[PDB]
Design a protein around this ligand. Structure first.
Ligand SMILES: COC(=O)c1ccc(O)cc1
Ligand SMILES: [Cl-]
Ligand SMILES: [Zn+2]
Lengths: 28, 21
């Protein structure tokens, strides 16, 4: 499945879940 | 890491919390 299109959804998911704690997103 | 697990299969909020800071 496309990982870049999927990656676009995960960063929004992580934004909601992590809230104030933030996160690091490394595509590789 | 999050790529393979949350893209091929649907990850819950519980699984996604593991990638937070
Ligand atoms: C907004 O929720 C998502 O887009 C999502 C994408 C992949 C997942 O594994 C989980 C949630
Ligand atoms: Cl898509
Ligand atoms: Zn999409």
């Amino acid at each position: 499945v496309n990982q870049h299109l999927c990656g676009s959804h995960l960063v929004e998911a992580l934004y909601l879940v992590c809230g104030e704690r933030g996160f690091f997103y490394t595509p590789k | 890491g999050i790529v393979e697990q949350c893209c091929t299969s649907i990850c819950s909020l519980y699984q996604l919390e593991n990638y937070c800071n």
